[PDB]
Design a protein around this ligand. Sequence first.
Ligand SMILES: [Mg+2]
Ligand SMILES: [Mg+2]
Ligand SMILES: [Mg+2]
Lengths: 56, 109, 199, 51, 236
Amino acid sequence: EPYIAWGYPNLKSVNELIYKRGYGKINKKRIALTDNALIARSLGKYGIICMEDLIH
Amino acid sequence: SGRLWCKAIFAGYKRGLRNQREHTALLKIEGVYARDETEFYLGKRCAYVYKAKNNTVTPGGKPNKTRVIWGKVTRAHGNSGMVRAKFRSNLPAKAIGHRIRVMLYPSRI
Amino acid sequence: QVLVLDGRGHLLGRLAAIVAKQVLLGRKVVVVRCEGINISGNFYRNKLKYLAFLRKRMNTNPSRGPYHFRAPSRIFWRTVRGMLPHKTKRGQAALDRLKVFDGIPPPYDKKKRMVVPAALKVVRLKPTRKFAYLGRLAHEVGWKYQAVTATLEEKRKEKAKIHYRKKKQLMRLRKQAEKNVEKKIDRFTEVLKTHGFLV
Amino acid sequence: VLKKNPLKNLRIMLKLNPYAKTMRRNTILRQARNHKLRVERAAAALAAKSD
Amino acid sequence: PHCSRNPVLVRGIGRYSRSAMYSRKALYKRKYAAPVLATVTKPVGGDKNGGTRVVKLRKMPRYYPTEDVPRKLLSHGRKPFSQHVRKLRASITPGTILIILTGRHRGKRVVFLKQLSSGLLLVTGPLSLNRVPLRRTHQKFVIATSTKIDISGVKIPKHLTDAYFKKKQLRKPRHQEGEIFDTEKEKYEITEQRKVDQKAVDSQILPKIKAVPQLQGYLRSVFALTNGVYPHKLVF
RNA sequence: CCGCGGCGGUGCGCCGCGACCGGCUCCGGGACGGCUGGGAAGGCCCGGCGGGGAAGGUGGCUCGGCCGAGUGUUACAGCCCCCCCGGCAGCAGCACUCGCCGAAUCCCGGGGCCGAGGGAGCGAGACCCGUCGCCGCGCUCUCCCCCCUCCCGGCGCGCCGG
RNA sequence: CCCCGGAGCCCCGCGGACGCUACGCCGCGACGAGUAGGAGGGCCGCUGCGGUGAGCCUUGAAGCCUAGGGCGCGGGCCCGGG
RNA sequence: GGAGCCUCGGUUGGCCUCGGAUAGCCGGUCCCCCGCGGGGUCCGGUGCGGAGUGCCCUUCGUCCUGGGAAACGGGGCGCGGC
Ligand SMILES: [Mg+2]
Ligand SMILES: [Mg+2]
Ligand SMILES: [Mg+2]
């Protein structure tokens, strides 16, 4: 507790975070989510195929 | 035929108490005492103008003893109308408590 | 280009701090009528506070030790010095811009002289509090020339009364002159109250 | 690749999420709609005041 | 060659849609059912004995340097100055008065004429009053004072443009070395076309500024900051 | 040699401008959602029902010129205030800024600062170069019409024909 | 519905860098306090030996000096003048 | 009056009552006292101070000529006396 602040984020908050500062762990390399191709490549086996699906 | 620059004093460098960052001057502009009265001066060109023994060149003029270090009022500094400046070379320290001319002429008026 | 302040009615420390910053920014300051500076807290309080400062002395060779200036001007100069970096070159340079006087001598007697209203006693202290005149304090701690300074200021005040009287008489003539002339200055005077003076 | 931030760069946003085009086509048009209707309300209030 | 069938809502966003546009352009009914060796490419010439010769336009080069730099990377949205879009402070409208801050005409007041193709301002402090001819200036080194002559119907010459108000002299070789060559030439001469233009523009302007009382005097005067007046405080 | 034609690297030294992107920090607009489906308020007034301070009142006394001012008492309403029933569109987190929380219920425009850091063409008869992904569009290979009118052409600044 | 010694090329499997000292070159991430102590790399430095530079040198070697010009994070090094 | 090293800061001026603060500033005195003034009473004005440092003064292109309003003001580092 005394080491964190936390709470229940908005929808906006989730959008802002992911778009502005969304980086995917891709072959263990922190990589920026500049195109869906990245998200799909890693998460596509879960019916997650774009940034919107990630947010969802 | 008169003065085309607002008077200001070179108060000292941007600094915490015990670390002075010599690449960022502080400017006390004359007549302006609020982080409010200072949007006029942001982005304005400003000169520290000082003469010295040996002659130099002079744009549109014969050689002179005067020299200037050009700068630029970047942003306001703390409540009471103080401003930060940034000069193409750092300011001498000799220069503290002396005139630096703030121009008008990157005007947004 | 030179601040002349009337030290009268001002608070010792409160004026000093304002003078100190001005002096550091290259402004040449003259403080005048320093005996009129007055310090918060009752007189006896501040006498004892001075008499303690007098006790502080370099035991083995007092001739080196802290120089206790008696004169109110020099007292003020001392407290201003306390708010500068007076060991540096810049601090010394700044102190050299300052000029301080017991009473008000001849360059400054015929100069309009300002007042710091942020250091002014009427403003800064509650009216039921007590305070000390730095003249009396200096007088009782050693200062020799209270009486002399007093007499010179009477003469100065008399000479100033005359000056004022002549200024008043001129101002009166100006007011009458405007009334004499108010049809051949009418359409100048009109424009000087469209753009908002005279009103 | 330089990460241009979507929330400023419209055409980066569209490339990530193309539905944003339409969402911003709406909520200009919707806002303009509502501004107009506010001016008409104000005019009707002024007419009622004059009456 | 029709114009743009949807208008602009915001930079980059059309008013209409995909489907709304399909309807307007009408993609319905506009459906397009459409299912070297010996011969030399580009040389050729004439010539006498033996026959006609085959030349070669653009012949391979007679020297290669020992190393050279290797292309770039295309880079998307850099246009040249010519192709840029030009701005203006709303303050500056035609016939407004300026304070020209920078040049030799420094602190002189002036009548703004027109934004030129460059994005510079054309300007005239009617040479007769102020001693400032038809002259270019920059928005940025100029204070747009809130004093406007009504200049609406003056025919500023069409031929006077960015191109004409442009410095002229100096070519390359000549004698060069010694104590000569284009340190002289000496004077920018005014020319007669320039004086006629000034004449033509000023005559149209000047009567309008004399209709506003004291304004010719104002334009004669020079601007400057004195004691107790601070740019941020005062207005223009 | 004149072309500063096309391309490539550059600037002797000091400068300035411009638009494009990245990261910031501020400014100004506007449009919405929710709540005790906000609370108070405003405006119109009407019909009632009480209670309180305390009044165009009265009264003792005082102070000024029957009138004005200052205290004091019982207290109805002819100064108000408060509760209760019943009912009107003007409200709207209201520029009459009295008190929130927010944004797929959210957008636009502007200003200051710092930064640009990489380089998918080394073919002999045919480019020294584009461009990938995304936006749309825009246009065209479909026809219509309308307007304005910049160039040019025609007719009488006006009208008609890119 | 044909052949690249010629499709003209954003992809080309017919041949392949300006690039390829493969102990080389190139790209993406992440990270970087340090005594005692350990390890790696030093086109850091000294003296002598086998090789090697058709090396340098009285038209001036070593050494020494230098408010001369430079390189390297650095150990250091290279040039100018004496 | 001429050149000529060096040291720099500056880039309109403000030529003044005293003071008070639960108070002040200006008038005018019809009237009275004192040495054109000073002090008094009385009255009339101001008082978030406009006889205001939120202030005042000064202007910042040069010349020409040919009208008006304003007009005896300015100068010659003009010259002597009090
Ligand atoms: Mg100078
Ligand atoms: Mg003694
Ligand atoms: Mg380490």
